[PDB]
């Protein structure tokens, strides 16, 4: 239901899922032959099922086609520093694919939002839902669309008739946790013949 649902969330308030008291198999997520890009840092993509971890943190949101290269540790920009920062010790595993026939429609689908302005930087793994008007000048505006005051939250431009580098890409990241706790969720031993 995280992958296939009726609709998704935005980047300023994304879906947070915790996998506990479960068991899974990462072999069906590799032989799907339906994902566009697949990056998996910190661990090899084919030898992550044998090693066991404690918790799995999965976040799901939408992003454009030209910003899929920004989900990586060690760069600056507009989305990766104001919505979701990536730390240096990031052992996550990002999976992205194109589903332009469901999250977009004719006439202009503007249901998903994003944050453009921010006062300063933010700590990684932190959500920002502040809808306050970012003041640019030195005078207060008291919530008006006048001078030296602009709204940080802006709308998308998703259209299903676009090209390849600007389509709504369903991107998910699977991060692992390492603490003083036994193994909880982990791929077990494959049933051989």
């Amino acid at each position, epitope marked *: *239901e995280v992958f296939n649902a009726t609709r998704f969330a935005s980047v300023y308030a994304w879906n947070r*899922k915790r996998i506990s008291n479960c068991v899974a198999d990462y072999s069906v997520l590799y032989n799907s032959a339906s994902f566009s890009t697949f990056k998996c840092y910190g661990v090899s993509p084919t030898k992550l099922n044998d090693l066991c971890f404690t918790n799995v943190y999965a976040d799901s949101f939408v992003i454009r086609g030209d910003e899929v290269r920004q989900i990586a540790p060690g760069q600056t920009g507009k989305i990766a520093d104001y919505n979701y920062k990536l730390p240096d010790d990031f052992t996550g595993c990002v999976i992205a694919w194109n589903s332009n026939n469901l999250d977009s429609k004719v006439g202009g689908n503007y*249901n998903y*939002l994003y944050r453009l302005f921010r006062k300063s930087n933010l700590k990684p793994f*932190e959500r920002d839902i502040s809808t306050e008007i970012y003041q640019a000048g030195s005078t207060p505006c008291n919530g008006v669309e006048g001078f030296n005051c602009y709204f940080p939250l*802006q709308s998308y431009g998703f259209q299903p008739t676009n090209g390849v580098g600007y389509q709504p890409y369903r991107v998910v990241v699977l991060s692992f946790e390492l603490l003083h706790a036994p193994a909880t969720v982990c791929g077990p031993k494959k049933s051989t013949n």
Partner: antibody
Amino acid sequence: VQLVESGAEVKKPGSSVKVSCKASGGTFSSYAISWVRQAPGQGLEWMGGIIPILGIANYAQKFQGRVTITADKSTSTAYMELSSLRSEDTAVYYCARENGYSGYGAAANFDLWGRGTLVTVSS
Amino acid sequence: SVLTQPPSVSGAPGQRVTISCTGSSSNIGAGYDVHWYQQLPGTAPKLLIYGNSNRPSGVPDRFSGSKSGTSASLAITGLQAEDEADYYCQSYDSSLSGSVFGGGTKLTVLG
């Protein structure tokens, strides 16, 4: 500030209801406005929240496409339209305000509420 | 729905009365903040405490909110003549794609 709503209103089982949300003063065209309902017998549900600046709708997956909420910038008011009423619509709606913040949680809170609109329907 | 609450709780006027809120590992245990409200039968509900760490203007300091892992707790000290209302859990649920409230507890002994 204070949000004033309409009083009691009754309709037919299968008609449309037209209530309003008035705001006294300002700070209405800058923050998100949602609608929280409450019925005697069960808990409190949440239909959706509407941003007045960009005019973007944001509903929940438990409510289907039968209710539409619009906003206005000339008089700073909000309207609620809901048709095809059922037998379990005897509840009260509230015009709430949202004030986001920063932190690890970042959950939507309702600091400012409305008065209340008793919308009952029967034969 | 996903959030359950006890139907009733007993207390004495002068001791500590605590309440417990249990849900799932995706709405309250995932990392989202909890919000407690008071539903008085005859007026509109207001805000009591947000984030379990700050104090709004106009609320007494007798309310204490904490999050112990996957469950949230609310503790009060002293029962005055205005606690005849209901307490709810509000937390952001990702499976429901929005905020969902709890069941609600009634706080009355015998009078």
